Amino acid sequence: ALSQKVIPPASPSQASILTEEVIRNWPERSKTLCSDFTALESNDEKEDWLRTLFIELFDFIDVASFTNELVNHERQVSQASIVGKMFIAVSSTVPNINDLTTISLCKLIPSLHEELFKFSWISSKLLNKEQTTLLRHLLKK
Amino acid sequence: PLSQKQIDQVRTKVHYSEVDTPFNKYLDILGKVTKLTGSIINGTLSNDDSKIEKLTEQNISQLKESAHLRFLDLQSSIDTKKVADENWETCQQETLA
């Protein structure tokens, strides 16, 4: 009797408009997405689109996605800054739903591996006991 | 035995550690409210069985007050640090002149 907790309104899965269609036609669609990303100018606007894609991606969750992130990051290395890595580093922690699947997926991708050390919770990856001891000492000094 | 790449990794980790408490507090309130919003959107949210929220209408005012206080605190914090940066820049220009 605390609440009815009965919800008449409902929403169907018609989202992922920019990450649209079936994941089928995988390589053609993936190359199309990479080309579209490289196409855009006005870096700011790019960031916007990225958000959508990334959250849509975390709706699905895999190795294909990791390869896609590899291609995106490597294409972004041509320029100076790294926006894709930072945006993954935020949109990995921001959403409501998550699990250790994020830990594993980050453990898989080696490109943004150092960006993850920079900002996110990377106590897991740097697991060599020698590394964590060196870390404690270097921090305290 | 630790290689070079691992040492560079831990060095960049130490060179970037920041501890900003007002920011973390504000983001904590953001999480603590969006979790409850999403739970109620799911429809099977809770009866305070799990540790995500309490639907009791006696602590909602506590949530609003905390939101206001933390928002104002973080606002003042970034205001202070940008003022300090402007001041340091002014002094450097003065001594250069």
Place this chain on the structure above:
Amino acid sequence: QLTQEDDDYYRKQFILQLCFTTNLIRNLISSDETRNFYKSCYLRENPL
């Protein structure tokens, strides 16, 4: 500054510097106990 014959404080600074550093080098070489401490300190901040 150094060779003036009337202002000798600079030579005192130089002599003091040599004496300090030589004291440390002698203790390092001969004691074989502080050597372990300095080796540990150099290593912990940089294992290579």
Place this chain on the structure above:
Amino acid sequence: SNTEELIQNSIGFLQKTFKALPVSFDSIRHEPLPSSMLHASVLNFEWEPLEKNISAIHDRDSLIDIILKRFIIDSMTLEKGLLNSCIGLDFVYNSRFNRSNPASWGNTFFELFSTIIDLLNSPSTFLKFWPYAESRIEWFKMNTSVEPVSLGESNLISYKQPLYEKLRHWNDILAKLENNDILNTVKHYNMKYKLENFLSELLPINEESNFNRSASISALQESDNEWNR
């Protein structure tokens, strides 16, 4: 809304009350403001609004903290702002017993201190203000205890809740002042000395971060800073 107007009324009332007092700046630089000089109404947190008693009951201590912070900030942005800031910084010490959680004054007091250290215009003002912080050291040394410590004993640690960020921040400021190395006026060296001596006197001689662990100093050059070279 309710809290914003509440804060505005409170800051107005505080500004008036503190403008009332006669204590001159130089008088307070060296002598602590005694408790008698304020009415017991201003203490015990019975103030002008006193209207949202049920509403503001939720978080009491935090409210005073944020309104005092805003007071310090708006007054700081001088020989007058410094006076108001010092009076508030002494007030928060004197009003400790009335607080709900008496220990919580520590993390509050230090907090305000940091803010005002940030707002000082130039090292001239910093040297004009430091004699205060050197007058009331024995108030820093008690992290949470409400009773004074015996002269010569400190209960502060490098990693404790009070210093956990403050030591990091002040080491940042020291490093930045050291990094100039070319455009340093003597005021800068005097300021860095005052700061290192304050911090070194805070923590005991024995703490793990009060004696360097064998770092042989580089950058010992005595050249004329790339002038007349």
Place this chain on the structure above:
Amino acid sequence: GRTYFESLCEEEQSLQESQTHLLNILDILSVLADPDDLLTESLKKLPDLHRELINSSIRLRYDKYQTREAQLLEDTKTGRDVAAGVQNPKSISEYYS
């Protein structure tokens, strides 16, 4: 996001929108949890605010990262770099000699 100062202002401007979204959501939730046909409208308007709060928060964290990066880049410029641009070294050398 060129310098410390501009990045700070941009972070503040994002904070403002996040705050107003949070306040609207808190108001709607307090209305819904109040002791029909109003609760239906509330639960109907909810998801639009839900999938706006997340965007605001994601953007906020992105700016926080960016400004940390900018500050750390600024802090490496030593004094000699700023002082290399002085006009007349002659008078300076005469002074120091």
